[PDB]
Design a protein around this ligand. Structure first.
Ligand SMILES: CCCCCCCCCCCCCCCC(=O)CSCCNC(=O)CCNC(=O)[C@H](O)C(C)(C)COP(=O)(O)OP(=O)(O)OC[C@H]1O[C@@H](n2cnc3c(N)ncnc32)[C@H](O)[C@@H]1OP(=O)(O)O
Ligand SMILES: Cc1ncc(COP(=O)(O)O)c(CN[C@@H](CO)C(=O)O)c1O
Lengths: 421, 498, 130, 46, 22
């Protein structure tokens, strides 16, 4: 019954603290400070160096055309919006960019979010509900994993890049379908897949995954946040790469931060599906919209990509020779295809643990800053993760490099890889 | 000193918050209205097994689409049947800077709101009362905004990297030292979206085996970050200390549901000046009550970071408490500073943990240069020249607008000094009609319903500003009085006659 | 819910279903009391026991679309203040259709049957079977 | 009284008739005249 | 003046009261 003298006595209860004491050894703790803009020739900690770890694959960041078109829209709009876009928060630069992205991807409509991590964390759970089943790549990025967790449902992970395993896993759903035909009519299936993964670094097989959707009646959500403005003859995603109609890929969602060098994300598709996020998109309505000087810098960058569709051939040649020039180093190996831009350098013959394994790569990175070359290693959260990648180094190539600066990059890293490993 | 309670919390100034009760005549006629719309909803949805009555409207591909209906037939019975009838009152585009008078694009539908066309004419002058423009820092030609275009040249328009790896500029450290001296805390950290300060740092803090003591009507992002954390959520009633204290000493004697063990830690998520019912939290009574039961407090001042107080710093300065008494502080720079993003605030043993384990610092890119150099020069202006003058202006526009609008005979929620003023429209047809009559009278307002608030509690919000003058307000009070008689919105038993 | 306001509309709904179904002089009989019992018991069974789901969109993300209206309301709490009111008032309509019926066992076989198809699904035993 | 134009406007608001299409707002209006028509029918007997 | 239901019509009053206290 727990009388009033007992219930006051049980107030000796003391809790855990709000935050455990992070150790000094903790790797993330120290952040690099960059003076000036993080352009091609950046200054990291007072060291003039040529970077290989920012994502502006087309430059477009120190472009006089882009910085002039974004200055002319600070002079008539100020900086910020005020309202959350359902309430006087659409500035008409927004209407002019959602209209202009849908014509670039040749679809019917696009929506624009104001932050790149929430464009796909809030677009998965608007469609997927509790009684579903989603088949994931299993090499997916964190932004998908946070969207799948909010869309409470059944998540089933198939192995990396194999249709055999994907097929194997669909056939069991048709078995459980015909064992309860009544309830198999009310549940929808989705396949969530990426093009050019940011972990593994390869492309998914898309032509044999689309003729596999017409058999098992699933739906495809492609998430091309890296291959938007990289792959294809016109830079048009991964569907130009293979030659597949866009009317077969359902939802498509990139972000405007890597090839466009801006802030925020979009999500383009047909108007039957893209017209349901305005009210149920969690991050769309309950949040302020995008500053109109960032939406004017994204129209102008999107004009530059249509003036020369020949910038996509000098990015494919550029990234082709540095992937050949890193094949004979002893200690650490190359993961990714020739046409892919990031290609992180993994560590071959692991020492033993992780904290020791990160410590080996910290010395290779820190030694190269003294030569001329800036690079970083891929950061992760080891505890909140469905499949944890091994430690690696990320090597990001851009168009504003040179054959001479690309070779100097491969010969310098081979000279210090064997002097530490 | 002014008022002490049994919860131990003491108030230094009076707390006068009134919430009128529905008249019960109006409350009947809201269900008569909502049922008619529903009854005809089926009728409009009846013609779906015959695609001839209505065409050229969003439907499946029908060339290879024999899958499961993507939207449940019963489902979305609100977007395409009730929202769509009065839909021309929300997504209104703008042609100029959003301070005081603003241009509106004129549009017109022929399909009874299924597709639009933009005629060409723009309403040149329109008093707007739907923009978080406190202290009015939203202008195109200002001294504070003149130093944001200088850093927009050399710096760029967006760092193509993440804070942990090559995406940490030197602008980002000179902001996080300035905020910590603004608030009165030891460290700080800035993010880039204020929605994702909450949905990305609540799950890094609490976990599985902890209790979250939410408030009945919080924002949708505090709801999201408490769902991703895996902690157990219990909802106490709106601004009710008796309902919290019951729900908080019932959770200590007992424990985790099935296993009955003790909880690991308990945190309470509250806000300052809630947007829907604009009302300040009873903050001396939570702090005097979390010291009794040894819980933690997640304060969240987004609608009061520049908008309330003797100098505008916080809901903490308003009550006269020391900030070093609240575990975490949240904030967005979109309301009073006219810039995107948001901070978080606390001790150095917490910000060292959030620079390390938060989801945004490792996967998401950071603030863009130009918008980070606008929050810096606008925060410096509040400390002084003329920064303590525009705060006193917003304090006396609130009082004047509020008593002159309550003496008329409307039903207004909230506290005496809270610059969001909700007017009550308890009918679903007056949502689509109060919004459309004010454009004839040259004034733009904001009207909401079920998506943001309770279905039966439709209202209209009147976010004030310091760029509003006395002559702008009296022009607007002249036209609410006329529309208040045209649709009969004056219904409150009491009437504060002067 | 507004417990005074939602009950008052519900009582006025019976009074409006009674006054329109009254004396109708092609059928000039006081069996319109029995017809007020017949329509309403079949009306409740549709809107509280047949229609399954919720009228909005993504309430709490995924929420129970396989649960009826009677068993999704009030967060599934047994006998609160309104679950009694919804099971005490249709049984009182049985008493009024027997003071103006003056039992004659021909409309009686339509009043007890229409009462059990309302009373049995409100029992807190069977919760999810159908 | 000429002011009957205003009293009809209130009938559209407090019955949610205002936002309904004017090709299917008479279906409600032609029904209620017959409901009252079958209620003035009702009136004589009993 | 009952016919044959006055027992069950009696127990319905009883079943209200057994339902009410909770
Ligand atoms: C006529 C036309 C009308 C026109 C209108 C159009 C409007 C135009 C658009 C304008 C755009 C406006 C932009 C500005 C917005 C603004 O200025 C700020 S306005 C921001 C206010 N927004 C909202 O508040 C929306 C979300 N609100 C809720 O979600 C409520 O809470 C419900 C009562 C609905 C859930 O109630 P419920 O869902 O029925 O109950 P559940 O248990 O199913 O809840 C489902 C899961 O969430 C958990 N949970 C429920 N409550 C919770 C709470 N309190 N605190 C923490 N968690 C809560 C439950 O524990 C479940 O967790 P799980 O067990 O993990 O699944
Ligand atoms: C606790 C909390 N967190 C976040 C936000 C909005 O985030 P934002 O920075 O994206 O506007 C608000 C207010 N949200 C406002 C934004 O103006 C709205 O109209 O939706 C809030 O109260």
């Amino acid at each position: 019954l727990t009388v009033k003298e007992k219930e006051e006595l049980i107030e000796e209860w003391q809790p855990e603290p709000l935050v455990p004491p992070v150790p000094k050894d903790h790797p993330a703790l120290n952040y690099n400070i960059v003076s000036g803009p993080p352009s091609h020739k950046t200054v990291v900690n007072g060291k003039e160096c040529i970077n290989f770890a920012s994502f502006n694959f087309l430059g477009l960041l120190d472009n006089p055309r882009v910085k002039a078109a974004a200055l002319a829209s600070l002079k008539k709009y100020g900086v910020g919006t005020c309202g959350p876009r359902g309430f006087y928060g659409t500035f008409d630069v927004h209407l002019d960019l959602e209209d202009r992205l849908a014509k670039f991807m040749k679809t019917e409509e696009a929506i624009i979010y104001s932050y790149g991590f929430a464009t796909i964390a809030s677009a998965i759970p608007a469609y997927s509900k509790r009684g579903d089943i989603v088949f994931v790549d299993r090499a997916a990025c964190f932004a998908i994993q946070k969207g799948l967790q909010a869309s409470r449902s059944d998540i089933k992970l198939f192995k990396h890049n194999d249709m055999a395993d994907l097929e194997r896993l669909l056939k069991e759903q048709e078995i459980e379908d015909q064992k309860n035909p009544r309830k198999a009519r009310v549940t929808r299936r989705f396949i969530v897949v990426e093009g050019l993964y940011m972990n593994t670094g390869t492309i998914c097989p898309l032509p044999e995954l689309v003729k596999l959707k017409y058999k098992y009646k699933a739906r495809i959500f492609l998430e091309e946040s890296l291959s938007f403005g990289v792959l294809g003859e016109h830079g048009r995603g991964v569907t130009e790469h293979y030659g597949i109609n866009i009317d077969d890929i359902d939802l498509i969602s990139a972000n405007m931060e890597n090839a466009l060098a801006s802030i925020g994300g979009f999500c383009c598709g047909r108007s039957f599906v893209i017209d349901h996020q305005r009210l149920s998109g969690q991050g769309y309505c309950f949040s302020a919209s995008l500053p109109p000087l960032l939406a004017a810098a994204a129209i102008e960058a999107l004009n530059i990509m249509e003036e020369n569709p020949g910038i996509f051939a000098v990015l494919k040649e550029k990234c082709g020779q540095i992937h050949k020039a890193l094949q004979g180093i002893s200690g650490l190996k190359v993961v990714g295809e020739s046409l892919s831009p990031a290609f992180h350098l993994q560590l071959e013959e692991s020492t033993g643990s992780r904290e020791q394994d990160v410590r080996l790569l910290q010395e290779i990175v820190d030694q190269c800053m003294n030569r001329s070359i800036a690079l970083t290693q891929a950061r992760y959260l080891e505890k909140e993760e469905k499949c944890l990648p091994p430690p690696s180094i990320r090597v990001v190539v851009t168009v504003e490099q040179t054959e001479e600066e690309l070779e100097r990059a491969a010969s310098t890293i081979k000279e210090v890889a064997q002097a530490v490993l | 000193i002014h008022h002490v309670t049994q919860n131990g919390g003491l108030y230094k100034r009076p707390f006068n918050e009134a919430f009128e009760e529905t008249p019960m005549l109006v409350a009947v006629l809201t269900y008569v209205g909502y049922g008619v719309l529903t009854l005809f909803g089926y009728l409009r949805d009846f013609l779906r097994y015959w695609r001839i009555e209505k065409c050229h409207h969003a439907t499946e591909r029908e060339e290879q689409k024999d899958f499961v209906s993507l939207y449940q037939d019963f489902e979305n019975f609100y977007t395409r049947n009730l929202y769509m009838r009065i839909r021309d009152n929300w997504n209104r585009p703008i042609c100029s800077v959003p301070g005081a008078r603003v241009d509106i694009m004129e549009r017109q539908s022929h399909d009874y709101n299924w597709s639009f066309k933009y005629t060409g004419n723009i309403i040149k002058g329109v008093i707007n009362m739907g923009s978080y423009n406190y202290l009015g820092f939203a202008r195109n030609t200002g001294s504070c905004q003149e130093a944001a275009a200088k850093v927009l040249e050399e710096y760029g328009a967006g760092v193509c990297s993440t804070r942990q790896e090559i995406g940490n500029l030197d602008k980002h450290e000179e902001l996080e030292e300035l905020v910590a001296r603004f608030l009165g805390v030891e460290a700080a950290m800035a993010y880039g979206m204020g929605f994702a300060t909450n949905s990305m740092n609540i799950p890094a803090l609490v976990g599985k085996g902890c209790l979250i003591l939410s408030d009945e009507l919080n924002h949708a992002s505090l709801v999201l970050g408490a769902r991703l954390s895996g902690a157990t959520i219990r909802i106490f009633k709106h601004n009710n200390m008796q309902s919290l204290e019951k729900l908080l000493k019932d959770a200590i004697v007992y424990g985790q549901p099935r296993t009955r063990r003790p909880w690991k830690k308990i945190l309470i998520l509250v806000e300052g000046i809630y947007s829907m019912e604009g009302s300040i939290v009873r903050l001396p009574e939570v702090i005097a009550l979390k010291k009794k039961y040894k819980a933690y407090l997640y304060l969240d001042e987004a609608h009061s970071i520049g908008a309330l107080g003797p100098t505008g710093r916080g809901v903490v300065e308003y009550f006269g408490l020391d900030p070093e008494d609240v575990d975490v502080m949240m904030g967005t720079f979109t309301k009073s500073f006219g810039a995107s993003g948001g901070y978080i605030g606390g001790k150095k043993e917490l910000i060292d943990y959030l620079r390390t384990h938060s989801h945004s610092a490792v996967y998401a890119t950071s603030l863009s240069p130009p918008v980070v150099e606008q929050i810096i020069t606008s925060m410096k202006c509040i400390m002084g020249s003329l920064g303590k003058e525009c705060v006193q202006q917003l304090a006396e526009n609130t009082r004047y607008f509020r008593r002159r609008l309550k003496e008329m005979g409307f039903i207004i929620y909230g506290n005496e000094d809270s610059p969001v003023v909700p007017l009550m429209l308890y009918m679903p047809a007056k949502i689509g009609a109060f919004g459309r009559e004010m454009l004839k009278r040259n004034i733009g307002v904001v009207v909401v319903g079920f998506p943001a608030t309770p279905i039966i509690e439709s209202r209209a919000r009147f976010c004030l500003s310091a760029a509003h003058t006395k002559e702008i307000l009296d022009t607007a009070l002249k036209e609410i009085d006329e529309v208040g008689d045209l649709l009969q919105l004056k219904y409150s038993r009491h009437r504060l006659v002067p | 819910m507004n417990s005074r306001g939602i009950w008052l509309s519900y009582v006025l709904a019976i009074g409006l279903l009674h006054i329109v179904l009254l004396s109708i002089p092609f059928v000039s009989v006081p069996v319109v009391w029995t017809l007020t019992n017949l329509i309403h018991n079949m009306g409740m069974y549709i809107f509280l026991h047949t229609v399954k789901g919720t009228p909005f969109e993504t309430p709490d993300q995924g929420k129970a679309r396989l649960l009826t209206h009677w068993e999704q309301m009030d967060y599934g709490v047994q006998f609160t203040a309104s679950r009694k009111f919804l099971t005490i008032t249709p049984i009182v309509l049985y008493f009024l259709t027997s003071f103006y019926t003056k039992y004659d066992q021909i409309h009686f076989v339509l009043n007890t049957v229409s009462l059990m198809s309302v009373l049995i699904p409100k029992l807190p035993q069977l919760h999810g079977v159908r | 009284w000429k002011q009957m134009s205003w009293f009809y406007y209130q009938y559209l608001l407090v019955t949610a008739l205002y936002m309904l299409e004017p090709w299917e707002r008479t279906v409600f209006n032609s029904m209620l005249v017959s409901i009252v028509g079958m209620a003035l029918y009702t009136g004589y007997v009993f």
